[PDB]
Amino acid sequence: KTSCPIKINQFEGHFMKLQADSNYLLSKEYEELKDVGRNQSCDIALLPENRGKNRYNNILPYDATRVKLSNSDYINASYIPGNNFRREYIVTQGPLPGTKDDFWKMVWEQNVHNIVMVTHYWPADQDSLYYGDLILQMLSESVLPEWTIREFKICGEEQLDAHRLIRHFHYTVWPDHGVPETTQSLIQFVRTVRDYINRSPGAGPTVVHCSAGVGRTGTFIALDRILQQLDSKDSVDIYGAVHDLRLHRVHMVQTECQYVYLHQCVRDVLRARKLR
C-alpha cells in the first residue's frame, strides 16, 4: 500500500482506533513505511571528491532525486513533490562553512524565494557580503515568539532573474528531544509559511532544512501537504504523504512520535472545524 485515505468525518475514530492498545495499529502502519525509498543508491554523494560536502556522512541524497549545481555539481539536497508540483520542495542539510556558497548558488539557480529552517550562513547585520559568485544582503530581521522571519536581497548570474527578494523562516521552538508541545504551534507556522508561499507571483521550490534535512524537515513538509489536503478535500491521507516524501529522501518523517504528531494535528484541526 502506498496510500491510506481517511474520510474526514471518520478521522477522529480511526485515529482512536489506531491509538488503542498503546498504539498497536498505528505502530503496524508506521512500520509498513520503513523500507520506502530504501532501494535507491547514493553513489554520487559517496564519491571521495564529495566527502567534505556532507555534514553527516550517513545522511545523503539519493542519486535519483538529488539537486545538481551548474557545472562538481554536488550538493547534499533532494527534490521533493508537494500538493502542487514537481520540484515543490528542496530538502537540504544545514550548510557547512565550506558549503555555504554552494547552498546560496542552489537557492539562486533553483529560483527559490522561501527558505524554512526548523533547527549561520547569512549575514549578522545589514551589510552586504559575497558568497561565491552571489551577493547577499539582509533587509530585515523580525524575531517573533516562536519563529524569526528574515528578508534578504540576493543577486547571482542572471538567468530568469537578476535580483530577488528571499524570505527565511526560522522556527525557534522545536524541543531538542521529541515533537513540539502543541499542535497549534507547528500548524500556525506551516499556515504562515504557506500563506507567504502562495501570495507571491512565483515562489519557485521552497528549501527546507534542519541540521541534516531529515525527520523534522519531513514533518514540516508532510504537515504542509496535509493541511492543504484538509483545506481542499473531504479525505486526508497522512500515510500517502509520508510514503511520497520517503520515496524522495531518506528519513522524511523519521520517528513514530512524528507520525503520531501529524495525526494529532489533523485531529485537532477537524475538531475545531466541526464546531464552526
Place of cell 507556522: 189
Category of 93 on φ-ψ map: left (φ > 0), alpha (ψ -120 to 50) or beta: beta
- 206-209 vs 114-117, strand pairing mode: parallel
- Residues whose CB is less than 8 angstroms from the CB of residue 133 and which lie 6 or more positions away in sequence, other chains included: 101, 105, 156, 157
Contact 109, 138 (CB under 8 A): no
Residue 215 known to bind ligand: yes
Number of structural domains (the chain) is 1
Category of 201 on φ-ψ map: left (φ > 0), alpha (ψ -120 to 50) or beta: alpha
Query: Residue 272 belongs to what H/E stretch?
Result: helix 256-274
Q: How many residues does the chain have?
A: 276
Task: Report helix, strand or coil for 13.
Answer: helix
C-alpha cell read off for 166 = 528571499
How many whole angstroms separate alpha carbon 154 and alpha carbon 173? 27
Greatest alpha-carbon pair distance for the chain in Å reads 58
C-alpha cell read off for 257 = 512520535
- Residues whose CB is less than 8 angstroms from the CB of residue 139 and which lie 6 or more positions away in sequence, other chains included: 126, 151, 152, 153, 165
Contact 239, 9 (CB under 8 A): no
Give resolution in angstroms: 1.9
CA 198 distance to own-chain centroid: 16
C-alpha cell read off for 121 = 550562513
By the 10 Å C-beta count (0-12 exposed, 13-18 middle, 19+ buried), 256 is classed as: middle
Amino acid letter, residue 228: Q
* Alpha-carbon dihedral sign for residues 193, 194, 199, 200: positive
Query: Which residues form the catalytic set?
Result: 210
Residue 155 known to bind ligand: no
Which residue from 23, 65, 34, 31 is spatially nearest to 251, judged by alpha carbons?
A: 34
Which residue from 49, 79, 167, 169 is spatially nearest to 117, judged by alpha carbons?
A: 169
Query: Residue 216 belongs to what H/E stretch?
Result: helix 215-230
How many whole angstroms separate alpha carbon 130 and alpha carbon 153? 12
3-state secondary structure 186-214: HHHHHHHHHHHHHHCCCCCCEEEECCCCC
Contact 66, 37 (CB under 8 A): no
**8-state DSSP, 34:** T
State the DSSP string of 128-174: -EEETTEEEEEEEEEE-SSEEEEEEEEE-S-SS-S-EEEEEEEE---
* Alpha-carbon dihedral sign for residues 46, 52, 56, 59: negative
Residue 176 known to bind ligand: yes
Domain that holds residue 132: 1-276
How many whole angstroms separate alpha carbon 252 and alpha carbon 243? 9
Q: Which long-range contacts (CB under 8 A, 24 or more apart) does 10-14 make?
A: 11/236, 11/266, 11/267, 11/270, 12/267, 12/270, 12/271
Which residue from 273, 276, 265 is spatially nearest to 15, judged by alpha carbons?
A: 265
How many whole angstroms separate alpha carbon 109 and alpha carbon 107? 6
How many whole angstroms separate alpha carbon 85 and alpha carbon 83? 6
Residue 212 known to bind ligand: yes
Helix, strand, coil distribution of the chain in percent, nearest 5: 40, 20, 40
Q: How far is CA 169 from CA 15, 210, 242, in A?
A: 31, 12, 23
Residue 204 known to bind ligand: no
CATH code where residue 55 lies: 3.90.190.10
